[PDB]
Design a protein around this nucleic acid. Sequence first.
DNA 1: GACCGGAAGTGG
DNA 2: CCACTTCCGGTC
Length: 94
Amino acid sequence: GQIQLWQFLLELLSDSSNSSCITWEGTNGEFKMTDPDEVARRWGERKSKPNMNYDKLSRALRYYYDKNIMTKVHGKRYAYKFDFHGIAQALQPH
DNA sequence: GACCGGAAGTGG
DNA sequence: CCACTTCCGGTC
């Protein structure tokens, strides 16, 4: 797979029919996984990695902290916030 | 349990 | 190369 997790989360987030498992909620960029497990099995599907689970996916998100692509929303389960500072950069090619 | 981050490894 | 994937030893 060549798609990126943040890109894929957005894809999902861009249709509200997927709200049964992920949804925008809060200030600009915030969202929460209403079904963390379905999100993971989907990402797994998409990347042909079928042992994907939330514990692994969440690790990948944690890596995004240093990249400023995302922060954790503190004291809110399964909630993160996209940050534009780093998205801007990750949208740039070579 | 959830969340954190180090470390090794992987495959488009 | 690099963004993950896998796994794990810690904090609550």
